[model samples]
Target: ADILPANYVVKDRWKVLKKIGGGGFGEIYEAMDLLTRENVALKVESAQQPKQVLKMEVAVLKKLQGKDHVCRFIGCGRNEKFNYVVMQLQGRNLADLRRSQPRGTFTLSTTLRLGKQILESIEAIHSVGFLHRDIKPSNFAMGRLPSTYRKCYMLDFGLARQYTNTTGDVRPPRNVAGFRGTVRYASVNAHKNREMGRHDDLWSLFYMLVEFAVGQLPWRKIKDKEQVGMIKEKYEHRMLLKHMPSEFHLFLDHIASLDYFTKPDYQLIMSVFENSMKERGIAENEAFDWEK
Candidate 1:
């Protein structure tokens, strides 16, 4: 079935306000929680489609609940027609915010601050024993309330996967896995269809920060995945050094140097951005480029 129309009720509790967004697996809606009398974001997947990712999303969110920088998961349920997950409603995503900039880019100062927050968010996700295979700008958003406006929250766990077992043992990487992320921001390993680990996520983050600083990636216009991967492999270092702050080169170098299973040095990675701020005499304030 298609998305529920406006005013459609679900589980006799949630009333659809409007169709908010849609992705590969399902549709998203802004609905009023009749039981709680609160507005919430609802992700609905038709029973007719494979719902494994939706199930995985809910499981990962449950594991990540109460963590800083991660979205708050309310609950999940299903009816005869759809499976739905409810979560905290967020404001505009970073991608939308970035596009609204003067040249569709952020100042080094703003990038550093937001990048730090994003890094912290990734760190939180990793600490919870899951890896966010997707780390693009759109997956991050600001909180809606004024008090929470300065804070950024990570979204979309549909591509997330557990890296550890119940015994707290890290899972060994596979030799190869099919493509699993957005090509533009995907890591080199992802392009190779190689097994992805924490470093891969960080690689994507580095690319995202470069895009934030420069407004667009060099490979953004290339629709061919292989060409994008080739360009990224051939010129990533040169491109980062050419168009972004010097700190970014070091950032990539660090990520590239890490082994698959090594714990990422969160503080060390953060220092690159923090040091950039200090060198430029930029204060680490809550104000973002869009807000300014």
Candidate 2:
């Protein structure tokens, strides 16, 4: 007779419900805490991943517990089958929303709101010394709509890690080779396996916001490498503002000019976001009101 793995119950305080989703590395489940009556989303990874990586994520989340912009990690554990991370579940990600909307219809207001939230979340993530290697639209979600403007929350740290402090380019591990992180939105440096610091994240985030504002990818119309090359050549020839909105152009300019020696402060990015929202005719203070 074959023996089955034991059916485990939640720790004294929690009850597991149905699974919500899963990636190659982990599965997420909806669960409730009996003592607090709080609903939470949990990520369970197989025992195969390095123990240190799991510990790092849990430690980072714990350090970020008081932050409003990040998803709160409620609990963590490991068993024979897997290790788990419990967190607050929020709304659908940006990619799903964009797919639902018609092409060429995404508004500047949406981009502005999303950009601000992403910036804030990036700050929190960086503070904990972890780099969110994947900063695509799918990693972002509105925190319970109608609450605040641009109140966004980031998810999925499966690729995140404490990047080694270095000066030159750094490539992804061989295990993640061929993974281009949404392909179209990744920075040139990321494509080359060069160093992807916070600025790289900014680059990806800016591209994502621009996609939402324009309702399409930056080079959506380009089908061939020749066209892509020409597009890049154009960007290099003239300032981004000449081809895009002033707000977006300004933001891109900062990203382009930013480097190891003269990195722009996080506050500067927030200023650009505010200016963009104003130019787009959206209420400035309504930045996070959409998450209510």
Candidate 3:
């Protein structure tokens, strides 16, 4: 059942403006905060669905609050029919921006700058004991507000899980558990349904960056999941080296070398791109290709 209506008020506090889009768990909307008179994104799930999804997302957002590269959580509420979370609104996602590009790709300078920001965001997620099992272009967005316009915020925690328990103990990896993320950017570990950790997320990030640079992955046309996985297993690395800058190959090698429990050197991985940018004489700038 639908959980929101245009102008429908929730908890007498938020007025639904319109449905924005549906995320992995449920429907999303743009709403007006009655007290603050500010716009906020409202994600609502029907009461029939497991409320735990929204609860999990709320927990992650609370842990990530005040971080520069994460979306800000406003509040959460429930009515007779639904449970919902409120958060800061963001502009178009990277996937949308990519499609708007003339070459359907970002310039090397833009990719490097965005990559650094994404790594920082991933670092923050890992620091909070969570792993963003899903790391793709659509999961990231630029801020809409003027003050935050230059920042990229990681969104959608529907597939996120804790790598560590409340006692600060890392959980052991589980055996095959079926596919868990988008196939196009999933890690090899993810493809095998093995226990995924920070390394898995980094691997996905590497694929995403390559896709951003090259416009599309070589296997982009493959629709069968198993076939896609096989292609990635056989040729993903080789193709990356063939089409991308040498820095990307090194970056993937570094991420691939990390153990499941070992923390990634975020700065070191970022430096690979920074060094490439320097060698290319591309100075860091806040201007994204989409903006220009």
Candidate 4:
């Protein structure tokens, strides 16, 4: 592993350490703060990428501070060479955790544990007027111990956008043609290019939680192109959750309604997770202390 210098360091600030990850946007490196000697994840984006997105994410993160389920945003900076944001490091993503688990339905209690943390995090995000257009297992990370020892941190805001929690007569146009998220968990309306509302994130959340419960999805596999068509067909025919378990089907039933004017409330989804857990008789009322 090669340790790189800060793209442009502030005097007596942070020292870049190792390059941890990178993507189409740019790269992410692990850095150490000179003042506190704490490890921070530094995101470096190219000059070509839209600066507004980074700015927006920073603002959203600022509002999200003090929330254990949301990663702490230390700071953001931009120089002629590169633009970067520093945030707290997190543990493994949810996808990796699930992959490591056995190939069996997740016990209902475990599902509720995960769902509550995610909803709490999203509630914070939504409260401040933003839509986490991309909600998948990959975007969630295990939270810190003590109070939130068993919780997960909602990660990644690259595709997030600001939207008020309002429903009206005029629907926003759905110009996003291609698929934008993990196919299996995307809501039918979102997959169909319908303008995704705050509820869409809830829809994805429900799908993922239910998937966590059942250990498999209705469709074994689906391609990106096929996803749009499949979702449209399901929405048109009202068979969206046609292949899920009976209890799970009841949950999806609410999402399929998609009554933008009266979309499925997130509380209902949380209740489903709780009820599912109680029914399965898994460990209940486990203490989640964030402060060690």
lDDT of each: 0.84, 0.65, 0.85, 0.68
List model 3 lDDT by residue over 114-213, tens digit each: 8888999899989999999999999999998889777888978888989998887888877665767899999877888888889888998898888888
lDDT of 3: 0.85
Error of 4 at 218 (Å): 3.9
Candidate scoring better on lDDT of 1 and 2: 1
Q: List candidate 4 stretches off by more than 4 Å.
A: 1-11, 50-52, 144-148, 165-179, 227-232, 235-250, 261-264, 284-292
Reference-based TM-score of each model: 0.94, 0.78, 0.95, 0.80
Residue-by-residue lDDT tens digits, candidate 2, 181-290: 55656676566555566787888787776667666655777755445545654565233334345655566767788752333478878988787666767885543322
- Candidate closest to the true structure, highest lDDT: 3
Model 4 C-alpha lDDT versus the unseen true structure: 0.68
Taking all chains together, the TM-score of candidate 2 against the true structure is 0.78
Candidate 2 residue-wise lDDT at 159: 68
Candidate 4 per-residue C-alpha lDDT over 1-292 given as tens digits, one digit per residue, 9 for 90 to 100:
2224555354358678778776565677878887878777777776566644667667778878987688888888877766778888777677776766677445555666788788888777877767788899888877544554466888777777666535523345456745466677666766677777767888778768757766766564666657555754554322434543345555666666665434446777677666666676646565422212
Distance from true location, Cα of 66 in model 1, Å: 1.6
Which 10 consecutive positions of candidate 1 have the poorest summed lDDT?
236-245
Q: Which 10 consecutive residues of model 3 have the lowest summed lDDT?
A: 236-245
Instruction: Go through the candidates in order and give the clash count of each.
Output: 0, 18, 0, 8
Model 1 alpha-carbon drift over 4 Å, by segment: 236-238
Candidate 3 ranges beyond 4 A from true positions:
none
